[PDB]
Paper text:
NAL is a class I aldolase, functioning through the formation of an enzyme–pyruvate Schiff base formed with Lys165 which carries out a nucleophilic attack on the aldehyde carbon of the open-chain form of the N-acetylmannosamine. We then characterise the resulting enzyme activity, analyse the pH-dependency of catalysis and use X-ray crystallography to investigate the structural basis of the changes brought about by modifying the enzyme.
This results in a repositioning of Tyr137, a residue noted as being involved in substrate stabilisation and/or catalysis.
Residue numbers in the entry:
A (entry chain B): -1 to 293
B (entry chain D): 3 to 293
C (entry chain A): 1 to 293
D (entry chain C): 2 to 293
Amino acid sequence: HHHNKDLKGLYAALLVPFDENGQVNEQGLKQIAQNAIETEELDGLYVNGSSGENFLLNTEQKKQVFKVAKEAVGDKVKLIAQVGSLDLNEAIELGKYATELGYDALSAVTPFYYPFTFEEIRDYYFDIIEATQNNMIIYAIPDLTGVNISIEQFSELFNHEKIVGVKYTAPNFFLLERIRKAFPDKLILSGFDEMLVQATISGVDGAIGSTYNVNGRRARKIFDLARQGQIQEAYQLQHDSNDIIETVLSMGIYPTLKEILRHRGIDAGLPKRPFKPFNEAHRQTLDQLIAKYDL
Amino acid sequence: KDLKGLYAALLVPFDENGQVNEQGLKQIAQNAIETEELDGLYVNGSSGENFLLNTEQKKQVFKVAKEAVGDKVKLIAQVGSLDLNEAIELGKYATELGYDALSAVTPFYYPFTFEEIRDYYFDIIEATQNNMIIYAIPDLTGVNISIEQFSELFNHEKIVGVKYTAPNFFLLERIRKAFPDKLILSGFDEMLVQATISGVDGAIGSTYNVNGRRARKIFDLARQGQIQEAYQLQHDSNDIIETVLSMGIYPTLKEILRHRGIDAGLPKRPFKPFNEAHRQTLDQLIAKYDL
Amino acid sequence: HNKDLKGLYAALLVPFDENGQVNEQGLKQIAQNAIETEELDGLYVNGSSGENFLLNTEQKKQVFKVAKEAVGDKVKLIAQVGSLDLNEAIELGKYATELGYDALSAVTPFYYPFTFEEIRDYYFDIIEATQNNMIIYAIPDLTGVNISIEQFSELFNHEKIVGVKYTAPNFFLLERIRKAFPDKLILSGFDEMLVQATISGVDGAIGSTYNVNGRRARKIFDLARQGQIQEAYQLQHDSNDIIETVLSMGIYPTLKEILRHRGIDAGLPKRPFKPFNEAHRQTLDQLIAKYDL
Amino acid sequence: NKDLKGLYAALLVPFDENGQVNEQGLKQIAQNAIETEELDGLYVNGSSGENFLLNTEQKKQVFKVAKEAVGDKVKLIAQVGSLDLNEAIELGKYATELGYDALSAVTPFYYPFTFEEIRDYYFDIIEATQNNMIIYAIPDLTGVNISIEQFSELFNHEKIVGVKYTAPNFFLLERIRKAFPDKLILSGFDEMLVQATISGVDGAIGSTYNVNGRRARKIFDLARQGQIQEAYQLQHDSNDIIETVLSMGIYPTLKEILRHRGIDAGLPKRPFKPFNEAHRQTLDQLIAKYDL
């Protein structure tokens, strides 16, 4: 019954603080990590994903993020390693690395940019797994990648015993339900924070999110209350969170989330160029959001 | 009447020449209210093959539907058309028949500006004096209506709500919050449970013609907090919905009703009749879910 | 004998009054302007440009009849009868055939997600009932409907599907179609890309802006085919200034405003299209003086 | 200080089984583009070179090998665009120190960057390298569209000297052409070379020119000579080639055409799959029919 359900829970998609030269701030990274567990009371980190600006880093920076995040948390804390890269050699090297550190599972975004064939995408996942022997979590983000995965295609992927589930962000709830019903034996972690409540009643096993770095407590309440049948209160907390998410998005989500962390005393530094620093023309509105929701 | 609740998007049976089978139409209407226990009918919508009809057929449908059902049945008339004159004329005829509100698809095909789209709704309201329900269906029309555009529409005291089909639950949420006193009726049968926990006041659907009981149970159980059960029922409804789409929805839905002894006739060309090659699979569905 | 349908057509504009009723005398002036002033080979009638999809059946007939009575017997006349209502499409196709239009045309059925087999048989039904030649009208940007080459060949296999009014913005698809169907009429419908369309082997063009810019359009088409490509292109530069400007202002109302400045009773657009905005007038007059419209 | 008009090969790269660069093979591909295909230049480490699959050393190696493989009459453009701005700067410097005539960069993708962010990514690379820059716009792969307004702001930088244009819109191309008469426009859709030519492009960069450049130049010359019907006939032929190679997996197949000439074409880098032998006969017919 609990087969493949080990990595259930709520996960922060770890944010990364940089210095003026795109270099990782290690003490700040350590702080954001500890904030996700200790303050936001979350189950795990999903490390070197979209939110950690992973795709702007060189190979050594990524390793560095994999190392500091595991150092900064206790053994009870679930850890997923996003090692997806267009460079399959890099992703294997990062895969072996993350595995040897004790990350409980790997994840990889679907290959993008090039119009890869399904067969090509499938064997990208098969090759990472072959070389690393770790469990693998599909990361489907069609809004950034342009890549869509039919139900027939998940069936082919989920047919590998080491492809354990999916970080699901397509916004389609007909698809999510088909998937949920077709593959009950597989983990589905949802990736759209602003739709947590809908994903919960669609039977997701949990969620991964950028905004759970600042709003992990409301997010837990949303997930737990919906699973309890307290729909109305879950939805009201989803209103609050959607105020939050909509505001962060209109200011540049990763810098803004990082400014919210700064305000708690964290050294959240800067985003990596070409991402721009938080624009001060947004500061007041950001402070109102913070006061109002006590972030 | 307050317009809350569950509506069949009324299907229409046609003969070989694409003419309305009045007697089968009466039967389809009575099936929705009496057998499927629905609150009302949404008449001349997408599911009634409305956009294939001429003006007289439209009137004929409005008349036969209204005459077929109890006085206390909620009735919404989709009068939306690319021909504004036609829509005004149809809005008047249905209002005079006693339809409780009007509904109109966002003008489509031509790339109308928002202002143009706005005053089409306002011209319709002005000529008819009936309440109006926006029919938003971007998958069919290519027209999206942003939150600010909903604000301006909803500022009109006679635009009392939306039949919402955009597959976007972040926007559904924002609209639900920004407009707590407007009517929201969801249009995606396959996502009724997600729409319900999102605070819609009801739902309009083509598959409620055959599966309105299950639909009611999703809406009620989800709101009473029996969410696991609501969701299981959605799993079941989505087998039904998936099969039917794969077979051509309107004719397949009509084949299901024909099975109950209803004279569900034919789809209007250029839709093709139900393909016999699907019948076994359809029979298995009907048998499995007692349709 | 049948006319060679090759050539340059106005997508005919229609003037209305305050109530969305056809202004017949203006419509006549518009049809005469296209042929006598703009010097075009023919009329494509009740197309997108005639605000056709806004009309009732009686109105579409009216427009078919006025357009035909307005031009000489030499003038090529194509009737757009595409409609979601197949019965109406057939009644219109027969009415235009009886008027003596040289070909029918029909937009691909839209709104509903029709099947390709369904789109095909809508066309075959129209032909069966009218016995006229049929021109497919591909406007994927308004319909959201696309036709692949295999779908075009299944369509073009009908001997009475004589061609396509092609408005997809894909010059790879167009080349393939040009290649695969040398025996079929391809008329391009993207006025702003007439030069590229000519050099790709189109048999002519249908277009709304030819109502005011037909002289330049003909020179683009002639010069491009004579290999005077640099001058051809310069006239497309100038033509696209005009297209872009009227686009920005609401194309059908603005084109009818230009017709108005020639003394034509171009009336109003049919609502929900709004009338030409006075705030654009100055710019339009400058455009009119600079390109002598 | 060359003007950069003309026909470029987007240079393909041959790999071994472990995704490593086959150098000897690379040299043959550069020389085939220049010597056999009679082209003005190479666009190096672009989409066609499986660039975005490579690590940083690999991109250097390609830049270095391609450059050593050709003479000084040969115009060279270094595509250094990268989600990693540090890396993009690093490569830009390296290419510029090797003598590349200009740099090029794909618009930052994956993340939904704002325009200001896209603009300053280009400005920083210029700042750091001081070479000329060529915008690589490829909306079909990136989902990034550049408006005429955004081109004007970009082209306002004296070092942004042009654009490799692969958008499929000829109204926009014509607009661009008219508004920026002083800038370089190199079209990137091989299947639309003729239409781009008569639309006033200064030349073209393409993957199929590795095997069909001779035929390409004739499209480009004939259409300018106004030998339009002939140019277009050669576009027909070319598009039979393009369509056939696309249906088989463009980069591997193109490299298999090169093998028939005795080039050590190697393999593509995974997750790209090697040319599938089920296509062999059809490819051989194509090579035979179009004399490749």
